[PDB]
Amino acid sequence: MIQEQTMLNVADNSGARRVMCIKVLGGSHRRYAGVGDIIKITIKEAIPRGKVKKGDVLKAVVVRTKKGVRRPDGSVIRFDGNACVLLNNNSEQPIGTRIFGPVTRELRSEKFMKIISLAPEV
Amino acid sequence: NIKSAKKRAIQSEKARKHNASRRSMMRTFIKKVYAAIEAGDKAAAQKAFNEMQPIVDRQAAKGLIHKNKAARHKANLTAQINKLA
Amino acid sequence: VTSYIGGEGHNLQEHSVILIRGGRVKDLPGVRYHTVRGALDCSGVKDRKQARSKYGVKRPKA
Amino acid sequence: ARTTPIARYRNIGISAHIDAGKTTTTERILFYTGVNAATTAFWSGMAKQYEPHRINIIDTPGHVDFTIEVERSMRVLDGAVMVYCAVGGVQPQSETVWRQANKYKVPRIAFVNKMDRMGANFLKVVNQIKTRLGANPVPLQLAIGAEEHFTGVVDLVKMKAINWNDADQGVTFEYEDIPADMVELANEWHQNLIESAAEASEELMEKYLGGEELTEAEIKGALRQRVLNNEIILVTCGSAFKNKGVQAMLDAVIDYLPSPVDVPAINGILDDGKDTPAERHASDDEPFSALAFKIATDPFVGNLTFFRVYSGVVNSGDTVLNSVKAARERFGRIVQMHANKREEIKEVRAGDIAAAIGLKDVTTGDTLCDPDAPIILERMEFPEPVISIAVEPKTKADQEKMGLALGRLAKEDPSFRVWTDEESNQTIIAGMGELHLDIIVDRMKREFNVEANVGKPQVAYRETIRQKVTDVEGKHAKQSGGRGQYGHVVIDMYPLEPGSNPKGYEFINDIKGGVIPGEYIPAVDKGIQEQLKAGPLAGYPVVDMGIRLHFGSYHDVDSSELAFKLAASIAFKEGFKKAKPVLLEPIMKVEVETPEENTGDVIGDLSRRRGMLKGQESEVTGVKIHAEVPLSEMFGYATQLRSLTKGRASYTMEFLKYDEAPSNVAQAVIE
RNA sequence: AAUUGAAGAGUUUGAUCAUGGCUCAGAUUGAACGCUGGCGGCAGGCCUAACACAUGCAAGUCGAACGGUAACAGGAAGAAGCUUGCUUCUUUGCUGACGAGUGGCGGACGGGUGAGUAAUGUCUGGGAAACUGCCUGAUGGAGGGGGAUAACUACUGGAAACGGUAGCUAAUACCGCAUAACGUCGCAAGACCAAAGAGGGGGACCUUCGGGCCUCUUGCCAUCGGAUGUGCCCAGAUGGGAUUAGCUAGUAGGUGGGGUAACGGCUCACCUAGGCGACGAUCCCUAGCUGGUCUGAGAGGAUGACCAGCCACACUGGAACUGAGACACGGUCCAGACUCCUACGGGAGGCAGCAGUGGGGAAUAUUGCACAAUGGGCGCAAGCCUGAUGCAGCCAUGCCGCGUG
RNA sequence: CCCGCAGAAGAAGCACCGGCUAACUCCGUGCCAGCAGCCGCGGUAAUACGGAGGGUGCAAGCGUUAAUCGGAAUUACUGGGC
Numbered sequence A: 001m002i003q004e005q006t007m008l009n010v011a012d013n014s015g016a017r018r019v020m021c022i023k024v025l026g027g028s029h030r031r032y033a034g035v036g037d038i039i040k041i042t043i044k045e046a047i048p049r050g051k052v053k054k055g056d057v058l059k060a061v062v063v064r065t066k067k068g069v070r071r072p073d074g075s076v077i078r079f080d081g082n083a084c085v086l087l088n089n090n091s092e093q094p095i096g097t098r099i100f101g102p103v104t105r106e107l108r109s110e111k112f113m114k115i116i117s118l119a120p121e122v
Numbered sequence B: 001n002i003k004s005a006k007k008r009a010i011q012s013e014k015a016r017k018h019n020a021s022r023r024s025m026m027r028t029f030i031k032k033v034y035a036a037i038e039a040g041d042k043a044a045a046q047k048a049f050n051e052m053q054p055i056v057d058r059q060a061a062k063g064l065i066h067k068n069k070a071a072r073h074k075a076n077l078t079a080q081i082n083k084l085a
Numbered sequence C: 001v002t003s004y005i006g007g008e009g010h011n012l013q014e015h016s017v018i019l020i021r022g023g024r025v026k027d028l029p030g031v032r033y034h035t036v037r038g039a040l041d042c043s044g045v046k047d048r049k050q051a052r053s054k055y056g057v058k059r060p061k062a
Numbered sequence D: 001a002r003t004t005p006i007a008r009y010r011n012i013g014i015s016a017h018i019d020a021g022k023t024t025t026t027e028r029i030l031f032y033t034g035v036n037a038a039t040t041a042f043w044s045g046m047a048k049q050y051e052p053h054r055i056n057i058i059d060t061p062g063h064v065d066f067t068i069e070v071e072r073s074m075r076v077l078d079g080a081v082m083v084y085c086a087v088g089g090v091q092p093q094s095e096t097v098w099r100q101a102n103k104y105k106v107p108r109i110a111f112v113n114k115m116d117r118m119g120a121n122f123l124k125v126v127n128q129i130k131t132r133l134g135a136n137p138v139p140l141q142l143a144i145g146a147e148e149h150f151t152g153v154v155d156l157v158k159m160k161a162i163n164w165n166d167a168d169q170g171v172t173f174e175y176e177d178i179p180a181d182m183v184e185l186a187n188e189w190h191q192n193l194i195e196s197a198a199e200a201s202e203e204l205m206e207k208y209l210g211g212e213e214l215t216e217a218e219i220k221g222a223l224r225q226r227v228l229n230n231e232i233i234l235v236t237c238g239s240a241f242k243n244k245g246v247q248a249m250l251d252a253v254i255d256y257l258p259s260p261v262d263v264p265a266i267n268g269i270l271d272d273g274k275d276t277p278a279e280r281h282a283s284d285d286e287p288f289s290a291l292a293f294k295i296a297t298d299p300f301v302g303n304l305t306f307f308r309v310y311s312g313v314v315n316s317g318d319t320v321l322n323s324v325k326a327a328r329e330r331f332g333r334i335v336q337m338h339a340n341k342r343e344e345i346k347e348v349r350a351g352d353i354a355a356a357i358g359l360k361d362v363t364t365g366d367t368l369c370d371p372d373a374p375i376i377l378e379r380m381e382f383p384e385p386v387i388s389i390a391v392e393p394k395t396k397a398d399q400e401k402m403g404l405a406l407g408r409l410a411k412e413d414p415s416f417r418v419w420t421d422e423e424s425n426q427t428i429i430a431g432m433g434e435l436h437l438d439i440i441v442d443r444m445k446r447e448f449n450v451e452a453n454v455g456k457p458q459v460a461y462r463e464t465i466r467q468k469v470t471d472v473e474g475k476h477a478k479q480s481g482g483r484g485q486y487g488h489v490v491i492d493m494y495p496l497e498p499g500s501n502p503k504g505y506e507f508i509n510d511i512k513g514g515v516i517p518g519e520y521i522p523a524v525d526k527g528i529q530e531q532l533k534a535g536p537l538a539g540y541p542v543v544d545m546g547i548r549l550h551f552g553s554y555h556d557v558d559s560s561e562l563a564f565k566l567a568a569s570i571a572f573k574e575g576f577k578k579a580k581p582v583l584l585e586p587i588m589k590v591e592v593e594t595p596e597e598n599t600g601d602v603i604g605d606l607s608r609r610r611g612m613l614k615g616q617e618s619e620v621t622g623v624k625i626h627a628e629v630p631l632s633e634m635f636g637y638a639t640q641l642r643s644l645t646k647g648r649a650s651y652t653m654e655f656l657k658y659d660e661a662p663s664n665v666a667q668a669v670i671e
Numbered sequence E: 001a002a003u004u005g006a007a008g009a010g011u012u013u014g015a016u017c018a019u020g021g022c023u024c025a026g027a028u029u030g031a032a033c034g035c036u037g038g039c040g041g042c043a044g045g046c047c048u049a050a051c052a053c054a055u056g057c058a059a060g061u062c063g064a065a066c067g068g069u070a071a072c073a074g075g076a077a078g079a080a081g082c083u084u085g086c087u088u089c090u091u092u093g094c095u096g097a098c099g100a101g102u103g104g105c106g107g108a109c110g111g112g113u114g115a116g117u118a119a120u121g122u123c124u125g126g127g128a129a130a131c132u133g134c135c136u137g138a139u140g141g142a143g144g145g146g147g148a149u150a151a152c153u154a155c156u157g158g159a160a161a162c163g164g165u166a167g168c169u170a171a172u173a174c175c176g177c178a179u180a181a182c183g184u185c186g187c188a189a190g191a192c193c194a195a196a197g198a199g200g201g202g203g204a205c206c207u208u209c210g211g212g213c214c215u216c217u218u219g220c221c222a223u224c225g226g227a228u229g230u231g232c233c234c235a236g237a238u239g240g241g242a243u244u245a246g247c248u249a250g251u252a253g254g255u256g257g258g259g260u261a262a263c264g265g266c267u268c269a270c271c272u273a274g275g276c277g278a279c280g281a282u283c284c285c286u287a288g289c290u291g292g293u294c295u296g297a298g299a300g301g302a303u304g305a306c307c308a309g310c311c312a313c314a315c316u317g318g319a320a321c322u323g324a325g326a327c328a329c330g331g332u333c334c335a336g337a338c339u340c341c342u343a344c345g346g347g348a349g350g351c352a353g354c355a356g357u358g359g360g361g362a363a364u365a366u367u368g369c370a371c372a373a374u375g376g377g378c379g380c381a382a383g384c385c386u387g388a389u390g391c392a393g394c395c396a397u398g399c400c401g402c403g404u405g
Numbered sequence F: 001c002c003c004g005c006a007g008a009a010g011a012a013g014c015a016c017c018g019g020c021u022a023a024c025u026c027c028g029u030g031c032c033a034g035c036a037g038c039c040g041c042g043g044u045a046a047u048a049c050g051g052a053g054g055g056u057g058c059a060a061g062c063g064u065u066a067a068u069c070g071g072a073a074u075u076a077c078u079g080g081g082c
């Protein structure tokens, strides 16, 4: 459950550190993004070197939500915090090159393969 | 790392575990002696010193503690076991 | 920095990549360097014959 | 050292219109040859039938845009496999690669790909090669059915209906005989295959007239003799996708495409001195001579320089000569791209191709010859760009780097060009077309990380007057405090006609007996001169102006060079104001060369482009159209000229004159 | 015989001199660029990004420590196609030899770089509390037992990296026991400490016929010397800044414990309240030091490439383990930045070793030949290893010769 | 390294020439084009610009730039001043 405003941590290099969701893309009036959805983003923190700089506007992939995820059977995965992987505005597709912290099976997408190839877990 | 004399790594490991365990007990024995001094028991001090002397010497020989260390222990342990005891 | 372009004529325009020399022009206060003719994107002086080593002009075909 | 097979060398390049499979078909080879963009691989013949032959393949671009990649990719190598879409007929860029093959008289066979596709029709296309390309086809084969009912092919030499099987893609065979369907068709060959083979030599056909069925061995030699002499194009057909056909075509390569010795020895020159064909027989024991086609740069080994060795040999360390630059190079590591591995080499013989690592300054077209036996070779031709567009480095910082990068892309692609407009100093690139330009700029982002946006090039406008203006008056009189200084001048300003090349400006000393001394008269000229560098309408040079002195006045002392120089300056103004000034624009002598079919559309567009037409010839096959059309209006012509003439239409332009710009233009051109 | 060598000129004025600065003649260079370019000898060659790195090489070696047989070779506890003393198959580790494994020694040398370090270093001269592989002198010891484990075998997980269970085995691997001074603690009396075998040959006597046994050659343990190496201490010298004047809690000293190879706030508890600084502490900036190099008549000024000595560093921060020696350049562990491999679960790597690419730049070279020599590691030796070294390739980069009559 | 073979045969550039500074004329140019280490050359007879002839200095190098010391007693201990 991510929604406009809401700070997210970032799970890649690129160098964002802290980032804010300025839109839940994908539908009129769509309230929440979570799981492995895409959101428009404005960088709030940014390391000094880094691909991205503060004030940039990009997209990103929700990779960990505290409300977590369910899928079949009835179980739950919850993560302590909210994190995402920055995507280039045109091609989706991570602008980063390393992923940090575990990611979930749901992300097993054509476009998000590069994330689960990286990333040390689930 | 691709230099096969990395057997040195697996080798000197066996070494560390061996050294560790022997070096461990010779310490716990030296302790037993200091304990006696703290307990005040003149008998157990000179008794425990007799038990530890061979250990300290043997290990020094085997090259785990080295000579002058061996000396220094029985040296000032003695100093103390017969300073009030 | 501002730099001198010696010899009669030159190519040399807004994007030319040159090699700057050092050596003033005491008619041009502020101009403290020469641009080395014949180096990189600067051509040598057309049709010159004497002192060709300065002005980057090659020997004309013995 | 020793070498190995030699003279069993097949230097062939695949090229054709877009789609077609001219690449898919190439990968298919590497599969077949590799049982158990330049590459090499070994074909023993699909049946085991052959002594292993060594094949150098080059998959070329379709498209135009990158036609340069075919000039080079056909100049150097010996054979050519022209691919055709079973569905798409000849199509425009088939004709262009045809002309490029003819330009270099390169022997060639033909492969009608995609027989499995809806609307497939082998013999139709074969006929278009005859009709549209004015060439002599010879169906060396026949298709077993068509489109989704495409099951095989007929070797109509060996007269058997070749059968490729289900799995293992290719390989296997069982060489089945013709089916009852085609026996009628099959009993042709184009009997003028065998009658085409006949025409090699009359003593070869004399027995054909005498009804003597020719031996299989003597036919293959027969039509090959004529393939080599490019009087015949064998057609093979197949479908890379179904794996039903590619293989039979490889055989046709060794059967009917040259060795490096079935070849005219190279032409050329000596250095300073004069001609002589450089000759140099295709022989290992000749003096080394090679041409450099294609330059690249790999991030790990540095500069790669592809060459074709026509004569002699080079060993890693031999210091050859770039004859067309008058400097020597020392060969180092050598690489052959070897199906899928940059295999290393210490020696490279004649008749082979490879890329030389580390060579310093060797551009495309240069000859690498023996230093004792220097020769210049032919050098292909450089297609000459048709499109220009101005570029600026998005980030002012990058402006330096944009310079570096465009430079690099130039020495890699001679068909690409870059320069700086002598006026309105903006960076201008030029290429063989819209797409060409696109991927160049894109290549900057990828490889040099300079993104830059693009725009229409600026235009150099000029200024003039239209009315002779009668005696206008200039005057100075500076009683201020210092140098006395006073000058007075009266003149006539009048338009000219485009006269005497260098001037475009005319000053006349029709001064009275001595109303102004002739020592100050140079000055009054200088004063006008100054005003011409950027006239009063909108900067921009003033042209085609004439000026006549007639009257003035001075003090015996106060007047001076300066005084009249200003007086003239003032006299020029007010006179210009009253002279009905106008904004000029530049026009081009434009020459469009187009087919008969669409000279209607082309004319109309030239007209639409605010253009004047002036002639038509009907020069042979196209129709040269002559027109005067303004510059600020020809931008991106290539792109549309193509659309209007199916890609088939050269054109050319250069400066001609300046004419009045239409008002809405003029008032727009306001800075 | 051998630090015995000091030059001036142009430029303000109508002219002059001085003033001052500017400028010039010389020598020098790891140079670059422009024009030009024949050879050879000797030497030099990334000064910038201690920027990032594809590929190959730069550390192994002993079967005379051990169990051993994967490949080679030979012999055969012996066998075909017959090509009967000339072959190619199966056995047998028998012998030569040898992949993997245990073990030993080396990997702390050799080589690279200058990041850090203004004094934790370097230089000069001294000093006392120390350890020291291989090499060496001397004196004796080298007895008698025990438990294991790789390899291996059997199941078994991985894509790979790597392994996992159970069982078996050898030794100079490992541990007791004995022996115990000219060794250690102790005033003494007294307590207490080690070790390993292996090869070549052989008369008898001989035995399970393995060899006992004899001999020579090595290796093992202990103590004291020598040699070399290393650690520690002191004084003096070794950049600039006051537009840095105050600095200091393990701080300065002491006592007693602990600790190291060793002295020591090295550490800790308590007691003293000290310690440093205008002879520049402190804090800033910059920097490897020296022999020497360049210049200069000298004193000086400038400088620390190439050679040699010392120090420091090894992708960045940190830590220890093994060891005589490291807190380890091609070792281990943690962490970080980054790159690479993956069958997505998981893996791997650090050229400032040689060559080489990209990058940066005005600019700096071959992905060469060889261990023949000198030298280094292992080995009784033969030998194996050696990008140290010896040569070659590239460049007029310098020096010196010679030619182009 | 020596011994044979053929034939001058395969092998010369670079800066300078107004004073400092060794080396001078014609032509072109006309405060233009340009030179320039310092002073300074160029506005119709320019040994100073550019070409030529000639000369001067160096020579497989020659120039230019950059750099350290020198001359600079111009941080003066040696060895200066107010």
Ligand SMILES: CC(=O)O[C@H]1C[C@@]2(C)[C@@H](C[C@@H](O)[C@H]3[C@@]4(C)CC[C@@H](O)[C@@H](C)[C@@H]4CC[C@@]32C)/C1=C(\CCC=C(C)C)C(=O)O
Binding pocket: D037, D059, D060, D061, D062, D063, D065, D066, D069, D409, D412, D413, D435, D436, D439, D440, D443
């Ligand atoms: C691989 C090959 O053989 O040609 C490829 C490769 C190709 C010739 C490309 C067209 C064009 O970029 C070519 C240029 C000159 C483009 C400009 C620069 O970037 C050059 C360095 C580049 C070299 C090769 C390149 C990149 C090809 C195409 C492109 C087709 C594009 C479309 C939209 C149909 C082709 O062949 O069709």
Ligand SMILES: Nc1nc2c(ncn2[C@@H]2O[C@H](COP(=O)(O)OP(=O)(O)O)[C@@H](O)[C@H]2O)c(=O)[nH]1
Binding pocket: D018, D019, D020, D021, D022, D023, D024, D025, D026, D062, D113, D114, D115, D116, D238, D239, D240, D241, D242, D243
């Ligand atoms: N179905 C089918 N497709 C083919 C065949 N040959 C080529 N193609 C297709 O052609 C397309 C482009 O192939 P490629 O050779 O790369 O094109 P090129 O590079 O322009 O020659 C791909 O979709 C191929 O699958 C064929 O024989 N059958």
